[PDB]
Design a protein around this ligand. Structure first.
Ligand SMILES: Nc1ncnc2c1ncn2[C@@H]1O[C@H](CSCC[C@H](N)C(=O)O)[C@@H](O)[C@H]1O
Ligand SMILES: [Zn+2]
Lengths: 177, 20, 158, 8
């Protein structure tokens, strides 16, 4: 089947390439989710910032199906995001200190563990940035991208990741396809 | 009072679905 | 005739526009006809979580413990039941009638069964959409009455 | 128990 960026479950102004793995931002923060979400286990996917011109930003992470598409990821209770500028973490529109910022060429890793103890861990070029969210809301989580203005990112669900985290057990998001 | 739904969803039972 | 998947998702693409949830003379709040619906046409799907029928009894006692009153489970067959108690659509609000204008019926779409309400006759805008619940007949206790107003009303939903 | 049926 394959795990791709969602065909309809997307903000209509986002530039999504025909392969449905590269997305270009347009104006105000708008979301796109992946075609598959997860409800249990440990899963992983990578996002590569292909191009981040001046005054452009990305908030990347996991979203439940009800998260607002016309808002940034992490705007409501359905998404937790990692912001490119200052490495801020956002859930319910509250930004807290998390890590250093990520820019153009950086490869970001998104880890989620949903046991049958829940955690979200962000990665910068394979290095653990720390637990960002613990004991999260129960539901299906889909890999999600929110972009502010014309920046380009490319999503990689697996099976091969460029920077596999050291000593971390997970399944690639491509296993859902 | 419910969550709105458009399409049917197949319940994916967990391994311990019938466990005490 | 037109293939079921074409008929089926034409429903999903026109259903929200043909029906609405209003206040009912039968009971509480009902599903009402907003545009004339021809006989035999698909009115709405009874959407929800499709579970194995063995789970309904684990499900039903759990809903009591949280206090949810009415049952919202509809049975497809011997193996499956649509649980619309927590996740569903406007088909939850369809009241029962002893002389109804719609009927429930199971259709198969790509190896998955759905419960779709069809128009028994021609239904005009303004009407309340009702079907025969067809509950198993219960005891004198746990026997709740019917107020559909039909001139041949059985007087009980059970 | 109390589920609707498509026939009795
Ligand atoms: N013909 C009828 N007469 C009286 N009550 C009815 C009825 N058909 C259905 N009901 C009641 O409506 C419920 C069906 S769920 C339908 C939604 C409900 N009418 C509402 O306003 O929210 C059942 O619990 C039953 O008690
Ligand atoms: Zn009656």
């Amino acid at each position: 089947s394959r795990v791709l960026l969602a065909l309809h479950d997307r903000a209509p102004q986002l530039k999504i390439s025909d392969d449905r793995l590269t997305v270009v931002g347009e104006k105000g923060y708008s979301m796109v989710r992946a075609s598959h979400g997860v409800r249990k286990g440990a899963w992983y996917f990578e996002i590569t910032v292909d191009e981040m011109p001046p005054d452009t930003a990305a908030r990347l992470g996991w979203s439940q199906p009800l998260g607002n598409l016309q808002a940034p990821l992490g705007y409501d209770k359905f998404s937790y995001s990692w912001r490119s500028k200052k490495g801020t973490k956002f859930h319910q529109s509250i930004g807290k200190h998390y890590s250093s910022g990520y820019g153009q060429g950086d490869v970001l890793g998104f880890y989620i563990n949903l046991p049958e103890s829940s955690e979200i861990i962000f990665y910068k070029n394979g290095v653990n940035q720390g637990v960002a969210y613990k004991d999260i809301f129960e539901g299906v989580y889909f890999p999600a991208i929110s972009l502010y203005k014309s920046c380009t990112v490319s999503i990689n669900f697996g099976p091969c990741f460029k920077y596999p985290p050291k000593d971390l057990t997970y399944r690639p998001m491509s296993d859902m396809g | 009072d419910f969550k709105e739904l458009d399409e049917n969803v197949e319940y994916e039972e967990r391994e311990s679905e019938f466990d005490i | 005739d037109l293939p079921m998947p074409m008929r089926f998702r034409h429903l999903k693409k026109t259903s929200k526009e043909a029906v609405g949830v209003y206040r009912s003379p039968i009971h509480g709040r009902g599903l009402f006809c907003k545009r004339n619906i021809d006989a035999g046409e698909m009115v709405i799907e009874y959407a929800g979580i499709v579970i194995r029928s063995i789970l309904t009894d684990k499900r039903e006692k759990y809903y009591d413990s949280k206090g949810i009153g009415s049952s919202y489970m509809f049975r497809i067959d011997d193996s499956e039941v649509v649980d619309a108690t927590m996740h569903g659509n406007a088909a939850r609000f369809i009241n029962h009638s002893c002389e109804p204008n719609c009927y429930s019926r199971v259709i198969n779409i790509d190896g998955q069964k759905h419960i779709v309400i069809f128009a028994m006759r021609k239904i005009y805008r303004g009407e309340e959409l009702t079907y025969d619940y067809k509950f198993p007949i219960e005891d004198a206790s746990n026997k709740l009455p019917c107020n559909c107003g039909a001139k041949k009303c059985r007087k009980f939903l059970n | 128990a109390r589920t609707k049926q498509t026939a009795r």
